[PDB]
Amino acid sequence: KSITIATEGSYAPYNFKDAGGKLIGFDIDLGNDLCKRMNIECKFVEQAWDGIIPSLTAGRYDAIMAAMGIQPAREKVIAFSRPYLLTPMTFLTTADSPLLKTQVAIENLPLDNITPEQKAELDKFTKIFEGVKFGVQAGTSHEAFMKQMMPSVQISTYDTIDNVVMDLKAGRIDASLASVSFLKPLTDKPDNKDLKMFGPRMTGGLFGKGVGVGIRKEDADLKALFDKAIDAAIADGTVQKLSQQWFGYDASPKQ
């Protein structure tokens, strides 16, 4: 038994290339680890984003591991394994903003079945955000979360996240909300040490279920094999270990 897994190869640290052009990254290391548990051979191939789903349905390969968010639009065409990595979102402000002084009672905040303690934390931040100029990228889940969960907060919209960042550095806005995968490398750059992430690391709700293995709907047995492998990889700490290695934070889901 052997499967071909498609990835982008242009989305570091999920899937990208080494100096020799070989596919590397979290998706590649996890894909190989999952296939090893499944006792199946693994081959990674490159596929441009626009054709990644049609080429799966055309049968060019058996699965997709390309930081693909499990979402209703994709679920209309393909099936997904259980999530293999969460997609945390967090807030961004300037270094020395008073917003950094706000104590974070719960670091990880899953939004789906919000506990009274979790809701109290989200209300506490929403309260402070009342007097803060907020900026968000238009058409994103970040804009949706602010419009649905934080109506008490004034928001301005931008075409790109780079433009949100430029206006925060210019002082036109005081804070933002974006993905940790974008914000962590951004704030790690010496030229951006005047910026800081803060607040809860949120997942679920409007932010989706996380990333999953894209599989043809008919391949029920392959999804079952992937689900068993993912649960075993979460259970033994492999997902957590690879998450820390590739991202510098733990985005592993619950088993």
Amino acid at 96: D
Through-space distance between the first and last CA atoms of the chain, rounded to whole angstroms:
27
96 and 125 together in one domain:
yes
Q: How many CA atoms does the CB half-sphere of 50 hold within 13 Å?
A: 0
The CATH number of the domain holding residue 196 is: 3.40.190.10
47 and 100 together in one domain:
no
33 and 109 together in one domain:
no
101 and 197 together in one domain:
yes
Domain boundary (206, 221, 241) is at: 206
Which runs of E-coded beta strand occur in the chain? 2-7, 16-17, 23-24, 41-46, 63-64, 79-80, 89-94, 108-110, 134-137, 155-158, 175-179, 195-203, 214-215
Element (H, E) at 126: helix 116-129
Please give the backbone phi and psi of residue 168, each rounded to the nearest 5 degrees, phi first: -70, -40
Question: How far apart, in whole angstroms, are the C-alpha atoms of residue 215 and residue 204?
Answer: 22
Written as six digits, the tokens of 206 are 């409007």
Question: How far apart, in whole angstroms, are the C-alpha atoms of residue 160 and residue 118?
Answer: 30
Question: How far apart, in whole angstroms, are the C-alpha atoms of residue 161 and residue 192?
Answer: 14
Written as six digits, the tokens of 8 are 């982008």
The structural domain count of the chain equals: 2
Domain boundary (187, 206, 225) is at: 206
Q: Which residue has the tokens 């907020």?
A: 134
Question: How far apart, in whole angstroms, are the C-alpha atoms of residue 89 and residue 205?
Answer: 11
Question: How far apart, in whole angstroms, are the C-alpha atoms of residue 74 and residue 97?
Answer: 39
Q: Could you tell me if 215 and 226 are in contact, meaning their C-beta atoms sit under 8 angstroms apart?
A: yes
Question: How far apart, in whole angstroms, are the C-alpha atoms of residue 46 and residue 54?
Answer: 14
143 and 39 together in one domain:
no
Q: After which residues is the chain broken (C to N over 2.5 A)?
A: none
Domain that holds residue 79: 1-87+207-255
- Model resolution, angstroms: 1.9
Residue 190 carries which DSSP code? G
165 and 251 together in one domain:
no
Amino acid at 33: D
128 and 173 together in one domain:
yes
202 and 241 together in one domain:
no
217 and 196 together in one domain:
no
197 and 102 together in one domain:
yes
Element (H, E) at 28: helix 26-37
13 and 105 together in one domain:
no
Question: Cα angle at 13 between 15 and 3, to 5 degrees?
Answer: 25
99 and 142 together in one domain:
yes
